[PDB]
Design an enzyme around this catalytic site. Structure first.
Site, PDB file in Angstrom:
ATOM      1  N   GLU A 357      62.631  69.765  15.218  1.00  0.00           N
ATOM      2  CA  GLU A 357      62.060  68.498  15.666  1.00  0.00           C
ATOM      3  C   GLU A 357      61.774  68.518  17.163  1.00  0.00           C
ATOM      4  O   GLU A 357      60.776  67.944  17.615  1.00  0.00           O
ATOM      5  CB  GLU A 357      62.992  67.341  15.306  1.00  0.00           C
ATOM      6  N   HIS A 487      53.118  63.047  -2.615  1.00  0.00           N
ATOM      7  CA  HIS A 487      51.883  63.223  -1.856  1.00  0.00           C
ATOM      8  C   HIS A 487      50.659  62.823  -2.672  1.00  0.00           C
ATOM      9  O   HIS A 487      49.698  62.267  -2.130  1.00  0.00           O
ATOM     10  CB  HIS A 487      51.770  64.670  -1.381  1.00  0.00           C
TER      11      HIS A 487
HETATM   12 ZN    ZN Z   1      58.982  68.377  11.366  1.00  0.00          ZN
END
Ligand code: ZN
Ligand SMILES: *[C@@H]1O[C@H](CO)[C@@H](O[C@@H]2O[C@H](CO)[C@@H](O[C@@H]3O[C@H](CO)[C@@H](O)[C@H](O)[C@@H]3O)[C@H](O)[C@H]2NC(C)=O)[C@H](O)[C@H]1NC(C)=O
Ligand SMILES: *[C@@H]1O[C@H](CO)[C@@H](O[C@@H]2O[C@H](CO)[C@@H](O)[C@H](O)[C@H]2NC(C)=O)[C@H](O)[C@H]1NC(C)=O
Ligand SMILES: *[C@@H]1O[C@H](CO)[C@@H](O[C@@H]2O[C@H](CO)[C@@H](O)[C@H](O)[C@H]2NC(C)=O)[C@H](O)[C@H]1NC(C)=O
Ligand code: NAG
Ligand code: NAG
Ligand code: NAG
Lengths: 596, 195
Positions: A357, A487
């Site tokens: 991240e 998705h």
């Molecule tokens: Zn990510």
């Protein structure tokens, strides 16, 4: 005054206006995801409503500047993104029709429940209910129930909506001058007006299929090895030559084969590297995990996290009463405000996620100087690819040894590498045929190459043919099994996970080449290599300003997505699988299904 | 010992918007430039033409302190020969600028959780400003070739945009209070020394 300099001035107004309004939307969203109160929902939607309404106004005003009389090609890119957004392309009824369909499909997926047989009392959602079954249960019938139940009571709900969803999305894309909604999605990789770096929307199909053909040998041997290991555990349920049952693949759809590791671990006596204990031994807290993750990017010549990162992020669960959304996310609110939202536990998993991240943050801080409309990854697969190559280096034993989380007494043998690479292939390699086949099905559906009365027929023909996966129960056209995945029902493109996978190993191989890394690619740590960081930063700073073909070239020296580094990463496993399948059948038969 | 009013310029509660940048003429007083250190880290204390190092035993005809607020990335534009929104449209220094530029972070003062829209800046202008020129006009900038008629619309932009200073902003976007000491030298009595 010309029509281009008018647009330059318009973008100048938009950027300053957009950054302020986007920050309000992002900060209100951040406050909700860290402090869950009904006011924080109201504030988040109130700023979110003003943000989309701002864009629709600015998108319409952007369309008043026609693209053809603009040469700058950076103004043209920024305007093209702004003009493209405006969904006034469809009638407000059909736009309202579609949005209701999108909301209903999303609600059906997120709230869809199924209740067990001979007890209609206990019902189970997908998260955590059915996902826990598909991820952990070794019982064939229980997984078969959760797999079939999810598709019969939620997928069948989504079938009439998805049919109309296709019609309206196609109608939108056609009036956007795209062939179909799939052509619209492939436009994310489109490049025009740049000699030597252009990329057509149809070239993505050719490149995905061409790169996938080189993946098939690695997948077929992984599929054969996984089938052999599963057949040992399920002799009565799995053919030695047939496709894998769809409910025995470690999650609801077989998107990742990660949770087959226990049944497919090559050397179960080898204990696997887990520095979670060592972190608790050294009393690591969450701030330590990010401080070390920070130090990792400083070691490659990337800046340390801003002061606002430490003051304003949330790295621990506030716990107690204050609720938070614990999905790890990297937040780029703009105005130099970079945050990471993560409920970090003291574990190796979160330690890798922190590097992953913070890799997103490093991307965000690199193109922060770019115009607002260009503040993004080069394409949809770039940003997540940057994150993955951080966990790749951070998880290597060399990196873990250098930071005191792995004793120097530890020595990696050739078996733990195979154990690690097999676990990687289950997630990384296993998703590629799933990802390609799913998006191909949607591409053919949007193209009209699959009639409505043949949706599930083709869908499971491709699952058998491409993924080597067979449905355990015959499925008529009342089912919509693709829509049973998030998705597909939540209107997210899926080929990004195929391209990002290939990008990340192109990225790593190039960085390890810049890091003078000797040995197999999967052992590589780019730490302490400012050459790799500068090579990576050369692309990170670009953002969306330059074509992703050139942005890729700034790292790997190649303009196009290549699959060779991915096969380089898994080569020790590939040579191991081929030997391990010397007396096993490699490939699969589509004619076999678990229903006789 | 008649002390110059640097207290009113630097310490002031609210600084001017950079488009409407304040100017405080300083004359007939002792200029103790060592007081001008609040010591709270001045992002910029870079002087041009004149050394800051204990060179206040020099005398000047007039001293002009131009105070305003910009964001961090735009402090670079308070310098000779600089370009960008601030230098072009808000506050321009001459190429042969003789004086000091003092800037410091005012996130504690000029930021607000809901966004401080007090401080504005000029985003559009028909031409760059002359050195030390000020434009407070709010006439709608005409980007198109059609008359704007004094209202905002297509190709018709209100020339001023707010910073929206929030405390959570990065350093580059945080509010920075700036004072620009201009030093004048005429064939004149030179009535500011401060021994
Ligand atoms: Zn990510
Ligand atoms: C396409 O348009 C962009 C702007 O929208 C052009 O980039 C800008 O180019 C100008 C010069 O034409 C740059 O101005 C110069 O900036 C430097 C550095 O600040 C300064 O030292 C000079 O005195 C001058 O002011 C400007 O910085 C630059 N960037 C931006 C964001 O405006 C670009 O060159 C155009 N490309 C083509 C092919 O026309
Ligand atoms: C892991 O390495 C060991 C040792 O290098 C391998 O064992 C040797 O394999 C060769 C075959 O090429 C035999 O000729 C040797 O007799 C083996 N040595 C021992 C001590 O058994 C082993 O095959 C490797 N395993 C994997 C999965 O790569
Ligand atoms: C702005 O006001 C502060 C006080 O509120 C001034 O800081 C003082 O400066 C004197 C002179 O060196 C010191 O003796 C004091 O100890 C300082 N006090 C504090 C609280 O900092 C500052 O000098 C003023 N700035 C100007 C330009 O007048
Ligand atoms: C959370 O929000 C409530 C009301 O929305 C507020 O009273 C409280 O102080 C907030 N707490 C935190 C930790 O943000
Ligand atoms: C780390 O942050 C500090 C903040 O004061 C900064 O001075 C420093 O330059 C940064 N990075 C390095 C490598 O020193
Ligand atoms: C990086 O350099 C530091 C300082 O020399 C050293 O302690 C650390 O072990 C190195 N790590 C790697 C992976 O090279």
């Amino acid at each position: 005054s010309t029509i281009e300099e008018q647009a330059k001035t318009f973008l100048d107004k938009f950027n300053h206006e957009a950054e302020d309004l986007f920050y309000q939307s992002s900060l209100a969203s951040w406050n909700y995801n860290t402090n869950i109160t009904e006011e924080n929902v109201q504030n988040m939607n109130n700023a979110g409503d003003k943000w989309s309404a701002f864009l629709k106004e600015q998108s319409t005003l952007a369309q008043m500047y026609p693209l053809q009389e603009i040469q700058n090609l950076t103004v043209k890119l920024q305007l093209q993104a702004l003009q493209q957004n405006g969904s006034s392309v469809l009638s407000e009824d059909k736009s309202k029709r579609l949005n209701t369909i999108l909301n209903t499909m999303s609600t059906i997926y997120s709230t869809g429940k199924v209740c067990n047989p001979d007890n209609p009392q206990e019902c189970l959602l997908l998260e955590p209910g059915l996902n826990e079954i598909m991820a952990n249960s070794l019982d064939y019938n229980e997984r078969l129930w959760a797999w079939e139940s999810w598709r019969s009571e939620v997928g069948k709900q989504l079938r009439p909506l998805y049919e109309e969803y296709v019609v309206l999305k196609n109608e939108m894309a056609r009036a956007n001058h795209y062939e179909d909604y799939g052509d619209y999605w492939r436009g994310d990789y489109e490049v025009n007006g740049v000699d030597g770096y252009d990329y057509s929307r149809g070239q993505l199909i050719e490149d995905v299929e061409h790169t996938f053909e080189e993946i098939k040998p690695l997948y077929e041997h992984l599929h054969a090895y996984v089938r052999a290991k599963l057949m040992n555990a399920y002799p009565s349920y799995i053919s030695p030559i047939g496709c894998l049952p769809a409910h025995l693949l470690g999650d609801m759809w077989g998107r990742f084969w990660t949770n087959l590791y226990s049944l497919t671990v090559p050397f179960g006596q080898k204990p696997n590297i887990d520095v979670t204990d060592a972190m608790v031994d050294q009393a690591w807290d969450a701030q330590r995990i990010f401080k070390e993750a920070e130090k990792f990017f400083v070691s490659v010549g990337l800046p340390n996290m801003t002061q606002g990162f430490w003051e304003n992020s949330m790295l621990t669960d506030p716990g107690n009463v204050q609720k938070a959304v614990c999905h790890p996310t990297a937040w780029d609110l703009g105005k130099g405000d970079f945050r990471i939202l993560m409920c970090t536990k003291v574990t190796m998993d979160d330690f890798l996620t922190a590097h992953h991240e913070m890799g997103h943050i490093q991307y965000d801080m690199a193109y922060a100087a770019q115009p607002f409309l260009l503040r993004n990854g080069a394409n949809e697969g770039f940003h997540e690819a940057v994150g993955e190559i951080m966990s790749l280096s951070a998880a290597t034993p060399k990196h873990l040894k250098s930071i005191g989380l792995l004793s120097p007494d530890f020595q990696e043998d050739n078996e733990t590498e195979i154990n690690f690479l097999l676990k990687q292939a289950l997630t990384i390699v296993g998703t590629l045929p799933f990802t390609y086949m799913l998006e191909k099905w949607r591409w053919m559906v949007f193209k009209g190459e699959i009639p409505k009365d043949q949706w599930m027929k083709k869908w499971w023909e491709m699952k058998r043919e491409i993924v080597g996966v067979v449905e355990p129960v015959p499925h008529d056209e009342t089912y919509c099994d693709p829509a049973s995945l998030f998705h597909v029902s939540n209107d997210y493109s899926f080929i990004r996970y195929y391209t990002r996978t290939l990008y990340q190993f192109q990225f790593q191989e190039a960085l390890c080449q810049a890091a003078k890394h000797e040995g197999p690619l999967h052992k590589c740590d780019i730490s302490n290599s400012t050459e790799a960081g500068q090579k990576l930063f050369n692309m990170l700073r670009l953002g969306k300003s330059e074509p992703w073909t050139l942005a890729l070239e700034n790292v790997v020296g190649a303009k196009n997505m290549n699959v060779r580094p991915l096969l380089n990463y898994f080569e020790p496993l590939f040579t191991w699988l081929k030997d391990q399948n010397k007396n096993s059948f490699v490939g699969w038969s589509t004619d076999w299904s678990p229903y006789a | 010992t008649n002390l110059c009013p640097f207290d009113e310029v630097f310490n002031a509660t609210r600084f001017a918007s950079v488009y409407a940048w304040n100017r405080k003429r300083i004359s007939n007083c002792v200029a103790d430039y060592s007081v001008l250190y609040n010591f709270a880290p001045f992002f910029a204390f870079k002087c041009y033409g004149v050394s800051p190092t204990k060179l206040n035993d020099l005398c000047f005809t007039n001293v002009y302190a131009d105070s305003f607020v910009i964001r961090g990335n735009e402090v670079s534009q308070i310098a000779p020969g600089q370009t960008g929104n601030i230098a072009d449209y808000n506050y321009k220094l001459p190429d042969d600028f003789t004086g000091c530029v003092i800037a410091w972070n005012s996130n504690k003062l000029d930021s607000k959780v809901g966004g401080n829209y007090n401080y504005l800046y000029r985003l559009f202008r028909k031409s760059n400003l002359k050195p030390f020129e000020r434009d407070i006009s709010t006439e709608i900038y005409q980007a198109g070739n059609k008359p704007c008629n004094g209202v905002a619309g297509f190709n018709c932009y209100f020339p001023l945009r707010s910073y929206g200073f929030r405390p959570t902003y990065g350093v580059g976007h945080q509010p920075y209070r700036v004072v620009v000491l201009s030093f004048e030298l005429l064939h004149a009595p030179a009535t500011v020394c401060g021994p």
